[PDB]
């Protein structure tokens, strides 16, 4: 990010994106593949609530927890609040999902997690 002299050397994704404040650009420079890069972008938009501080973002990129409403949740829980097993997210069995993986893959909606 800052200290533009740094904008010469090979930046680590951590060294340029986390503790500082990177946009998509320096991240991409570090990584060079829009797939995992926009996975990172989806996290970043989700980690909009996790911009500071460090840990707040290290855990947010870890993916082991839901940020309140769980827009960041990338775990694998298959039980509801009552333990009910979840349906297939991509398919509409048995109820039609209004917003699904075709609509918002940024939340990383898996099979039934």
């Amino acid at each position: 990010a800052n200290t533009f002299l740094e904008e010469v050397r090979k930046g680590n994704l951590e060294r340029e994106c986390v503790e500082e404040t990177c946009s998509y650009e320096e991240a991409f420079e570090a990584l060079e593949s829009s797939t995992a890069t926009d996975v990172f972008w989806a996290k970043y938009t989700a980690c909009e609530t996790a911009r500071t501080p460090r840990d707040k973002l290290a855990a947010c990129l870890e993916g082991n927890c839901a940020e309140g409403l769980g827009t960041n949740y990338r775990g694998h829980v298959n039980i509801t609040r009552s333990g009910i097993e979840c349906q297939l997210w991509r398919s509409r069995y048995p109820h039609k999902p209004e917003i699904n993986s075709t609509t918002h893959p940024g939340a990383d909606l898996q099979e039934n997690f």
Partner: protein, 51 residues
Amino acid sequence: RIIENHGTEDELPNYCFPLGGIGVTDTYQAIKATNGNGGATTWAQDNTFAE
């Protein structure tokens, strides 16, 4: 023994430079102008250049 302090002689700057003479660099992408007829011109990505 005696200091003939005429002072220095300089009126121009002197500059050192990067070994390539260009430090920073912003990646970029070739763009071709597709004719916007009846409106604003459209733009696409060239295939001749590297991306």
